[PDB]
Amino acid sequence: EAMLAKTAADNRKSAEQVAAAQADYEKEMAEARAQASALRDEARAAGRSVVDEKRAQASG
Amino acid sequence: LADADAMHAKALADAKAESEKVTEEAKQDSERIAAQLSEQAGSEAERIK
């Protein structure tokens, strides 16, 4: 009976384990996309600051 | 369960590898954007002068 219960628990745990491994896969995909979007955002923001201060220097 | 363990291991390895690769690609994109934007700023300075 313990083996039967353990087999049922193993089936359920492996089902949720494949589900959670997949979910972690999309989670880290979204994480990498978020960091890429960040990197791009702060890079372009620094570029905005640099170009704006260059415009100010040119005006002066 | 063994197959799920192998799937978890391979999926984690591929996730780490792909995440690293795409993170560095996004980096390189960021530096290229910054370089071309500094070039645009220099062109704007030349236009102002």
PDB file of C-alpha atoms in Angstrom:
ATOM      1  CA  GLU A   1       0.000   0.000   0.000  1.00  0.00           C
ATOM      2  CA  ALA A   2       2.903   2.366   0.697  1.00  0.00           C
ATOM      3  CA  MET A   3       4.298   1.601  -2.760  1.00  0.00           C
ATOM      4  CA  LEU A   4       0.904   2.281  -4.348  1.00  0.00           C
ATOM      5  CA  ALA A   5       0.579   5.596  -2.508  1.00  0.00           C
ATOM      6  CA  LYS A   6       4.166   6.512  -3.383  1.00  0.00           C
ATOM      7  CA  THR A   7       3.525   5.702  -7.045  1.00  0.00           C
ATOM      8  CA  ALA A   8       0.454   7.948  -7.067  1.00  0.00           C
ATOM      9  CA  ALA A   9       2.393  10.709  -5.310  1.00  0.00           C
ATOM     10  CA  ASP A  10       5.275  10.265  -7.763  1.00  0.00           C
ATOM     11  CA  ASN A  11       2.911  10.561 -10.722  1.00  0.00           C
ATOM     12  CA  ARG A  12       1.405  13.762  -9.329  1.00  0.00           C
ATOM     13  CA  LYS A  13       4.795  15.173  -8.315  1.00  0.00           C
ATOM     14  CA  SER A  14       6.330  14.433 -11.719  1.00  0.00           C
ATOM     15  CA  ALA A  15       3.345  16.004 -13.476  1.00  0.00           C
ATOM     16  CA  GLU A  16       3.693  19.166 -11.405  1.00  0.00           C
ATOM     17  CA  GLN A  17       7.478  18.936 -11.847  1.00  0.00           C
ATOM     18  CA  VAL A  18       7.256  18.989 -15.640  1.00  0.00           C
ATOM     19  CA  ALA A  19       4.699  21.783 -15.334  1.00  0.00           C
ATOM     20  CA  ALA A  20       7.004  23.768 -13.038  1.00  0.00           C
ATOM     21  CA  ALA A  21      10.087  23.128 -15.177  1.00  0.00           C
ATOM     22  CA  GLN A  22       8.178  24.461 -18.175  1.00  0.00           C
ATOM     23  CA  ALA A  23       6.928  27.400 -16.109  1.00  0.00           C
ATOM     24  CA  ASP A  24      10.498  28.137 -15.027  1.00  0.00           C
ATOM     25  CA  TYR A  25      11.478  28.018 -18.696  1.00  0.00           C
ATOM     26  CA  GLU A  26       8.972  30.721 -19.627  1.00  0.00           C
ATOM     27  CA  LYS A  27       9.791  32.587 -16.405  1.00  0.00           C
ATOM     28  CA  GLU A  28      13.473  32.863 -17.303  1.00  0.00           C
ATOM     29  CA  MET A  29      12.554  33.693 -20.904  1.00  0.00           C
ATOM     30  CA  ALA A  30      10.500  36.611 -19.586  1.00  0.00           C
ATOM     31  CA  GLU A  31      13.303  37.503 -17.170  1.00  0.00           C
ATOM     32  CA  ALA A  32      15.873  37.657 -19.972  1.00  0.00           C
ATOM     33  CA  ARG A  33      13.484  39.698 -22.110  1.00  0.00           C
ATOM     34  CA  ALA A  34      12.973  42.095 -19.196  1.00  0.00           C
ATOM     35  CA  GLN A  35      16.714  42.541 -18.661  1.00  0.00           C
ATOM     36  CA  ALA A  36      17.265  43.051 -22.398  1.00  0.00           C
ATOM     37  CA  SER A  37      14.532  45.693 -22.441  1.00  0.00           C
ATOM     38  CA  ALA A  38      16.119  47.321 -19.390  1.00  0.00           C
ATOM     39  CA  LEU A  39      19.635  47.342 -20.860  1.00  0.00           C
ATOM     40  CA  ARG A  40      18.215  48.935 -24.004  1.00  0.00           C
ATOM     41  CA  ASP A  41      16.158  51.470 -22.032  1.00  0.00           C
ATOM     42  CA  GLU A  42      18.962  52.719 -19.794  1.00  0.00           C
ATOM     43  CA  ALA A  43      21.411  52.707 -22.715  1.00  0.00           C
ATOM     44  CA  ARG A  44      19.119  54.904 -24.803  1.00  0.00           C
ATOM     45  CA  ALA A  45      18.394  57.067 -21.751  1.00  0.00           C
ATOM     46  CA  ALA A  46      22.109  57.681 -21.230  1.00  0.00           C
ATOM     47  CA  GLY A  47      22.328  58.452 -24.939  1.00  0.00           C
ATOM     48  CA  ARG A  48      19.510  60.971 -24.528  1.00  0.00           C
ATOM     49  CA  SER A  49      21.338  62.615 -21.633  1.00  0.00           C
ATOM     50  CA  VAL A  50      24.617  62.742 -23.571  1.00  0.00           C
ATOM     51  CA  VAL A  51      23.022  64.164 -26.713  1.00  0.00           C
ATOM     52  CA  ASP A  52      21.085  66.736 -24.676  1.00  0.00           C
ATOM     53  CA  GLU A  53      24.200  67.942 -22.858  1.00  0.00           C
ATOM     54  CA  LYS A  54      26.040  68.040 -26.193  1.00  0.00           C
ATOM     55  CA  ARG A  55      23.228  70.210 -27.561  1.00  0.00           C
ATOM     56  CA  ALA A  56      23.576  72.477 -24.529  1.00  0.00           C
ATOM     57  CA  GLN A  57      27.340  72.732 -25.042  1.00  0.00           C
ATOM     58  CA  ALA A  58      26.873  73.481 -28.742  1.00  0.00           C
ATOM     59  CA  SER A  59      24.317  76.176 -27.925  1.00  0.00           C
ATOM     60  CA  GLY A  60      26.611  77.792 -25.370  1.00  0.00           C
TER      61      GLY A  60
ATOM     62  CA  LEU B   1      10.575  10.483 -12.538  1.00  0.00           C
ATOM     63  CA  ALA B   2      14.011   9.828 -14.032  1.00  0.00           C
ATOM     64  CA  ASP B   3      12.824  11.266 -17.349  1.00  0.00           C
ATOM     65  CA  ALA B   4      11.460  14.318 -15.526  1.00  0.00           C
ATOM     66  CA  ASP B   5      14.794  14.762 -13.748  1.00  0.00           C
ATOM     67  CA  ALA B   6      16.621  14.569 -17.082  1.00  0.00           C
ATOM     68  CA  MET B   7      14.138  17.014 -18.608  1.00  0.00           C
ATOM     69  CA  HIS B   8      14.634  19.397 -15.684  1.00  0.00           C
ATOM     70  CA  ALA B   9      18.418  19.185 -16.008  1.00  0.00           C
ATOM     71  CA  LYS B  10      18.508  19.698 -19.777  1.00  0.00           C
ATOM     72  CA  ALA B  11      15.876  22.446 -19.632  1.00  0.00           C
ATOM     73  CA  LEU B  12      17.808  24.269 -16.907  1.00  0.00           C
ATOM     74  CA  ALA B  13      21.049  23.979 -18.881  1.00  0.00           C
ATOM     75  CA  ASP B  14      19.413  25.221 -22.086  1.00  0.00           C
ATOM     76  CA  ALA B  15      17.643  28.002 -20.186  1.00  0.00           C
ATOM     77  CA  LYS B  16      20.910  29.201 -18.657  1.00  0.00           C
ATOM     78  CA  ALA B  17      22.753  29.011 -21.983  1.00  0.00           C
ATOM     79  CA  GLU B  18      20.022  30.781 -23.959  1.00  0.00           C
ATOM     80  CA  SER B  19      19.525  33.413 -21.249  1.00  0.00           C
ATOM     81  CA  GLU B  20      23.260  34.144 -21.153  1.00  0.00           C
ATOM     82  CA  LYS B  21      23.474  34.338 -24.949  1.00  0.00           C
ATOM     83  CA  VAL B  22      20.440  36.614 -25.311  1.00  0.00           C
ATOM     84  CA  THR B  23      21.552  38.780 -22.382  1.00  0.00           C
ATOM     85  CA  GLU B  24      24.929  39.350 -24.023  1.00  0.00           C
ATOM     86  CA  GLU B  25      23.191  39.947 -27.357  1.00  0.00           C
ATOM     87  CA  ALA B  26      20.977  42.582 -25.728  1.00  0.00           C
ATOM     88  CA  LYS B  27      24.115  44.078 -24.203  1.00  0.00           C
ATOM     89  CA  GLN B  28      25.881  44.296 -27.567  1.00  0.00           C
ATOM     90  CA  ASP B  29      22.697  45.838 -28.948  1.00  0.00           C
ATOM     91  CA  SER B  30      22.828  48.406 -26.139  1.00  0.00           C
ATOM     92  CA  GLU B  31      26.441  49.382 -26.817  1.00  0.00           C
ATOM     93  CA  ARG B  32      25.783  49.549 -30.565  1.00  0.00           C
ATOM     94  CA  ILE B  33      22.778  51.784 -29.886  1.00  0.00           C
ATOM     95  CA  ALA B  34      24.897  53.976 -27.615  1.00  0.00           C
ATOM     96  CA  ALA B  35      27.674  54.229 -30.208  1.00  0.00           C
ATOM     97  CA  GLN B  36      25.351  55.147 -33.074  1.00  0.00           C
ATOM     98  CA  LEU B  37      23.523  57.587 -30.791  1.00  0.00           C
ATOM     99  CA  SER B  38      26.785  59.286 -29.833  1.00  0.00           C
ATOM    100  CA  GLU B  39      27.541  59.453 -33.556  1.00  0.00           C
ATOM    101  CA  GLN B  40      24.144  61.079 -34.114  1.00  0.00           C
ATOM    102  CA  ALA B  41      24.873  63.536 -31.298  1.00  0.00           C
ATOM    103  CA  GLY B  42      28.191  64.415 -32.925  1.00  0.00           C
ATOM    104  CA  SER B  43      26.460  64.943 -36.260  1.00  0.00           C
ATOM    105  CA  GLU B  44      23.950  67.209 -34.512  1.00  0.00           C
ATOM    106  CA  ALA B  45      26.822  69.170 -32.967  1.00  0.00           C
ATOM    107  CA  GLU B  46      28.367  69.552 -36.417  1.00  0.00           C
ATOM    108  CA  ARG B  47      25.009  70.749 -37.748  1.00  0.00           C
ATOM    109  CA  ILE B  48      24.715  73.301 -34.939  1.00  0.00           C
ATOM    110  CA  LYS B  49      28.234  74.591 -35.580  1.00  0.00           C
TER     111      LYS B  49
END
